[PDB]
Amino acid sequence: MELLQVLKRGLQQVSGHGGLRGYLRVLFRANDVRVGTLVGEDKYGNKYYEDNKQFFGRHRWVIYTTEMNGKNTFWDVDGSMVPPEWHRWLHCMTDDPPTVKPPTARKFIWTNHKFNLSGTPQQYVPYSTTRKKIQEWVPPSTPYK
Amino acid sequence: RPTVRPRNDVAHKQLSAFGEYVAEILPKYVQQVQVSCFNELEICIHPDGVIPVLTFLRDHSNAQFKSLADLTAVDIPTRQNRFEIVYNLLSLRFNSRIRVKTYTDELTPIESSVPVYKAANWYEREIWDMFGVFFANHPDLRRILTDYGFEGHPFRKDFPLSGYVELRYDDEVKRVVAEPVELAQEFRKFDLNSPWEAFPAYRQPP
Amino acid sequence: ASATRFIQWLRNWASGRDLQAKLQLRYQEISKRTQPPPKLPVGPSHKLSNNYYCTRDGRREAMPPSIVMSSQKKAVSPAPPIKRWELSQDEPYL
Amino acid sequence: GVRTSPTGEKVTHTGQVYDDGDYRKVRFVGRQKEVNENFAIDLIAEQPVSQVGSRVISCDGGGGALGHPRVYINLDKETKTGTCGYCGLQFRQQH
Amino acid sequence: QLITVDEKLDITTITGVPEEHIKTRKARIFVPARNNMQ
Amino acid sequence: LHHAVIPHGKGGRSSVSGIVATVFGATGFLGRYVVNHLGRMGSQVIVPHRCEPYDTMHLRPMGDLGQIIFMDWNGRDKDSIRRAVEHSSVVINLVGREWETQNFDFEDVFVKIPQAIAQVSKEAGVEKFIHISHLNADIKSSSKYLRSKAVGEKEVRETFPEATIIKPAEIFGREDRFLNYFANIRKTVKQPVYIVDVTKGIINAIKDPDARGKTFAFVGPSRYLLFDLVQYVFAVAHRPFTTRDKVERIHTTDKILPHLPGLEDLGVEATPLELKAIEVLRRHRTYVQPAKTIP
Amino acid sequence: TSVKPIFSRDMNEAKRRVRELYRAWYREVPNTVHLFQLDISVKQGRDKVREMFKKNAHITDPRVVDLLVIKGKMELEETIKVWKQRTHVMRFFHETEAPRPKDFLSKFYVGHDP
Amino acid sequence: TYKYVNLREPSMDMKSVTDRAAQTLLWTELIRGLGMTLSYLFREPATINYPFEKGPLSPRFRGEHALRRYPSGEERCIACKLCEAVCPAQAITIEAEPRADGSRRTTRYDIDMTKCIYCGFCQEACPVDAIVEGPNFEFSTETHEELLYNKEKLLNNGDKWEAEIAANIQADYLYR
Amino acid sequence: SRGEYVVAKLDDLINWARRSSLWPMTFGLACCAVEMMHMAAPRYDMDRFGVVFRASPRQSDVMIVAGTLTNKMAPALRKVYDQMPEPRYVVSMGSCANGGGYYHYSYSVVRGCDRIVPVDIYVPGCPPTAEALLYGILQLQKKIKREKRLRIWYRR
Amino acid sequence: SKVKQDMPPVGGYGPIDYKRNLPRRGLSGYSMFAVGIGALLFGYW
Amino acid sequence: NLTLNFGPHGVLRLVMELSGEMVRKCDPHIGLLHRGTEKLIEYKTYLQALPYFDRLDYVSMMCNEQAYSLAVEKLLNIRPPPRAQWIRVLFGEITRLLNHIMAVTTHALDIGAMTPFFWMFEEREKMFEFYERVSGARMHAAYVRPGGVHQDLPLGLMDDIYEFSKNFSLRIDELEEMLTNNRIWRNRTVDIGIVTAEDALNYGFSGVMLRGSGIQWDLRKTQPYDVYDQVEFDVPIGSRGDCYDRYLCRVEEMRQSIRIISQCLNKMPPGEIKVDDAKVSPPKRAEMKTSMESLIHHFKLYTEGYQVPPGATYTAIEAPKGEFGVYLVSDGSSRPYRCKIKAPGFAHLAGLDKMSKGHMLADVVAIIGTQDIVFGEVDR
């Protein structure tokens, strides 16, 4: 019966994640025990997988790193952790990952991606970028009335 | 000519002929009839003729404008009668549209056309709300779009875009309060008109 | 697409349709997310001669309305009466 | 080209910085002043002058339709270089 | 049937404008000067 | 005046009042009215808070964008105080507690904390300091709350001589522990004062250069017998007619201090309890001849 | 100078409508105070009604008077049928608005507006 | 041409009447409705595992704004104010002056992201591809003030996202 | 000490329960409500996060303001906020709710719902995509994870 | 080179269904009543 | 007569007078989403006002854009090129599917049938992708503009639209299995909100509110626009004038929309997608960056905007909710002088009291749904 072939596929996900500990780690971190092909890994530790037999939308996914920029992300993962070069591939704006089509290097491009910093001391605070418009007269420092 | 909208002379002639037809039948009320270059017919009437003219166009066998597509007002402050009242009507029998226009000022009532079209009910409430034109013999004339107690008629050309009052929740009185409007960034007025004439055909005589 | 043969039979029977032919989940039939560059055509006004703008200036052919009567024989309708619609032959009745 | 003031606040590329008695710098307490540290004035100055053999050269900023509108730069003066008004690249007529 | 009204037309009370923005304002009526740049 | 704090606008939400105020104790009963009035006219308000940020949320709508700034602080950490006041032109101290806790007794809350704020403010160069004391503050009181107020009132004056000190009676208002306190009950004369009157006086004291160095007493227009007050409260609440320290204070007759300026000297007209009692006590009605005033 | 009237053909007829509207408003205030659970007194509500009428006492155009009565009836309808909420009724009193100074010197100190 | 949606006579023969009685009494049409929901229970759901999986987007996607540079690092924006003029929401505020090297550059470039309608008209109007709407859509904040972007924030966005922005522009610019 | 340790674990427990069972009351004012519907729709299935599709205002923990808040509507929105049992959070979604958006200069529009109620999360966009809103809800969960109500209680 | 824009495939696309398709199912009223009464009679017996 | 201050798209305040179960009075109080759109438009150029139309019937975005574009094109005396016209018909009918799905499934969800909402909103999500691929936005595309459309279709889009369309009629079939013959659904809709043909016309109804009552009217047939005269489709007509017939009309219109989409895919022609007239439509970026004339026209079109010759037009289309029109007044400048938006739901909601006569409270939910009311366009 196919019930046996289904159960076997279930058991191969356990070995496909490196035994029970690895199978349970992805179950609790990502709520998904699917096994895919490793497309690549970014410098922050995120890993990118594909399975083209899944339906469009489920055929690409990222298992986030457990630590990024000094933050514990074992449980607290965020969509803003995906760096731009992989962002394009993960959202299917392109077919080819940065491992096959690397981005163009520029001197000014951030070498270190930052995730959403709202709510932290690194948050953006707005302010006016223009200088003072009117200069006040400063009275003399000596007396003469 | 690929980029130019094609003319339709046949429809222009038909609509012109019908425009004279209306003017001949209701000379008491019709002041002007015109057909635009994109073939839309406008009947300009004295305000006394709203009910007779609209009834004729709804009921006459050669009109049968059974559907009131829209009813609205335009504010033109330079005119003695600043408000132009526009009726847009549709005839399904003859697959045609006609526009009926009249005028009023801030103190002269217009006759409610609810007897002719039940659709007019809310349109006239909106005209009263946004422009302050009073319609006589309306079954229930009152504001429809603005806040309760709202002062003024926002769609008048001299009503400021951002109004006079704004709302916020005040904790001391534990309710929403209205206060004079202050904007962190003033709306930036732009002067866009080119100093060069664009359309000679519409030049006005000096 | 991953359903077992039994489960495909069960849901086809319950719905009464051949669901597997028209799956609502997309697979490889979708177009590639990287495409070759386009080369779009240009319009009729892309010419080097016989192309003066005053011969294709639609805005300047607009005119003020024709005043047919100003306050200063057979009856007519605004247009000919509308033609009766004809019942569809594709499927006149649901 | 980020420089700091006596109070310690970073100076932006537009020269902005709150002066000593300005209360408004309270907004940065416990947070931070966002300052971009890739000063474009310093970056364009690092680009070499381009030697050309004509009195007139054209610049489109590079990349064809991805650059800027194409302009023509006159290089008749020998005192200074020709500078593109859009991208700041410099040109010089050789010899 | 019409009536006779001789009062100067005054609608200040039915426009909803706050009193401050009627009494203290000075309207300037003019034809704009040509922009000297064109 | 530094150019950034010159007043501008029409005194509304988007205006610039020119006030940069640090309000300690901003998350309590009196703090929420003080912040509201400051934010109404476009002041910059710094709110140091000890509580969860969730508990400061009701203060956010009271200012235009950027006008309310929140900082962590600890009453025992002088650096956290310095961070909060070093940009302000006025410091308002509303820190208090109607009871003692394992971590903070009446001495910490009414003596050490106010003195530390006053000292750090003085060092940082803050020009105005407003300290709320109590009308019945007295070294020889039966209430340790009112004893600590007296000692603290002394220290604040010594540490910040130009401080404005304000001494209210028991304050009535929607979130008070006065009328609500009586309505929750299942010789002494009181002169209670309305919360909005006290708030208006504090705001005016900031704007009045004469308020510097003075001690005010904020009291209501009428004096009542405590028994007649409670009887009135029960009648208004349509109800058939706690700690040891709290009871001592409630039984302390409100002092009469004609040698001090009051609300009238700041331009505030005291609000009678009769005009605002229902505003506070309506929520106590399960769905009225006024108290007899001491003449 | 011959115009279409609204309701009234002259000031005497117009002033009858004004008096009728005032009576309706005067009798409605006590219900409004109770229904909206207002903290103002019935006297304050009636003092506010009188103040609103009194500011239009200089009108001599019967058509303007008719519109004021028409708008006053609409406002009364919104109150009686409780289409207004408490916030709308209390907007007449400007409780959160600070006292705007009137004399020349006070205005001079605060800003540039007259 | 037209058709009738609901103009049919039921058959009044005994077989047809008994068919409708059986439907009335045995709830057959209701049971047939149960069959359809049963078949959906056994279909694979359409849910994706966000944030580990993401919805598909295209290079044209209009997200968070950014200010771009030339390859040399010079700013592309030359303070022409075409974007400010076109902005339907008046979300852009610009001041400019000659830079110390004579360049025409901005001293203020603000976008109120809470006025912005994310319409993309600014990036159409820009003659030098300086202001773009980038691919980022995950930038919600805890405060209103964080969404009032000044030039430093927008330049930082450009330096942060340029790798992806350039590739997206490379894919769509022939349609522009 | 253990007393601090017990407080730290209890805060984790109550925070985990509250962020794991976020029941929203959605004020579907305008177009932003459509993207909110697409977040409940099958592709994103907010219910799978513990966010039930539509809760009653009295059983709600988060108010989502999804559209333009007009002046006429402002009192009603504040009334629903005041009836929410605590803890209660507000998510402002879209430019209109954030700061007025396209209608910021209108006479009839409140310039940001944060003039009427305190706001925990601002979701940018016009409208924000369903995914962007889901990002905002997840951000609110992380905010609740950071709460230390019991730790602050015992240091009082 | 040649113009390349999104176009339908040469010859067009395949046919697309749009007409309502609610197929007939089940037995007639007579048979259904017969099975129901048959069940009752066996149950009673 | 009991009175309720609120009973049952946006937010509505319904003041109803009841007598037992029966509704005696139904007084809708709208304006809860009035945002002064028509006034704001007076401060915008014609291009700047285009995005306001996405936010009216914000379920039918591109149909709203089409109506405004047609009105401006008529005043300009220009015409969009044929490919733009076919794209506009193609996405107008995709938009009709978007609207009718929302209209029918939220109508069902309001009276307890919650499941078809989920099935069909996955189809909506897929059409949101077609919007995003042509415009970069899922809803407020701002894609249809006076003079044509903003950009050409990306390569490969038409194939995916074909793939979606090939399977969609089966999704309608599953929707019909849940509702069409369900006796509970019929009990909630049959003989509810009956409107006679004469009353419908005089109350200003349009769209399915007319055809449900037997009137043979559809502006795509009688007063056709961009290329509707070149596609074949049937107009569904009701016989009872009730909610159930109007439900059937909407479901059949979805089928006819697919039929139109199939023809647009096959007859899509080559060419440019906006009028080859750079005093109206902006030039291509490559031209703007090389030719002096193109750069001037780009600069002027995005700052001042094009001037529109003075005049006034009432232009209407058969939007998914009925007749949607604008009365647009030009004063000759580059900003409209007046723009009145005729929203079909305005007249329809004005007829709620009439239609609710003799019905119970729960029928008011059904009647509001059958009218398909979005308060973005009612309130404007």
Ligand SMILES: CCCCCCCCCCCCCCCCCC(=O)OC[C@H](COP(=O)(O)OCCN)OC(=O)CCCCCCCCCCCCCCCCC
């Ligand atoms: C030999 C001698 C023998 C003598 C005895 C012979 C008796 C056998 C022949 C008689 C058969 C009796 C059938 C009993 C079931 C009840 C029948 C019934 O009441 O149906 C009619 C009812 C209303 O019908 P309606 O369409 O509204 O029109 C009638 C009003 N004009 O319609 C309904 O009730 C519809 C139900 C509405 C609820 C829908 C939700 C439930 C649908 C799923 C149910 C699944 C089946 C339940 C099985 C339970 C198992 C435990």
Ligand SMILES: NC(=O)C1=CN([C@@H]2O[C@H](COP(=O)(O)OP(=O)(O)OC[C@H]3O[C@@H](n4cnc5c(N)ncnc54)[C@H](OP(=O)(O)O)[C@@H]3O)[C@@H](O)[C@H]2O)C=CC1
């Ligand atoms: N209310 C009255 O009847 C009268 C009050 N006063 C004085 O007015 C001031 C305010 O009164 P009220 O507002 O009613 O007091 P509340 O108790 O209402 O508010 C107290 C404030 O003090 C803060 N606070 C208390 N203890 C500490 C602490 N240990 N460390 C840091 N912050 C602390 C609280 O912050 P948190 O919320 O974080 O604890 C809160 O913001 C007090 O000084 C009070 O004594 C004087 C006369 C009458």
Ligand code: SF4
């Ligand atoms: S996207 Fe539109 S609204 Fe936002 S800044 Fe650009 S032009 Fe203005």
Ligand code: SF4
């Ligand atoms: S971003 Fe572009 S359009 Fe805007 S001012 Fe700079 S160069 Fe001009």
Ligand code: SF4
């Ligand atoms: S922010 Fe945009 S999508 Fe949301 S309600 Fe406002 S206009 Fe509509």
Ligand SMILES: [Zn+2]
């Ligand atoms: Zn260059």
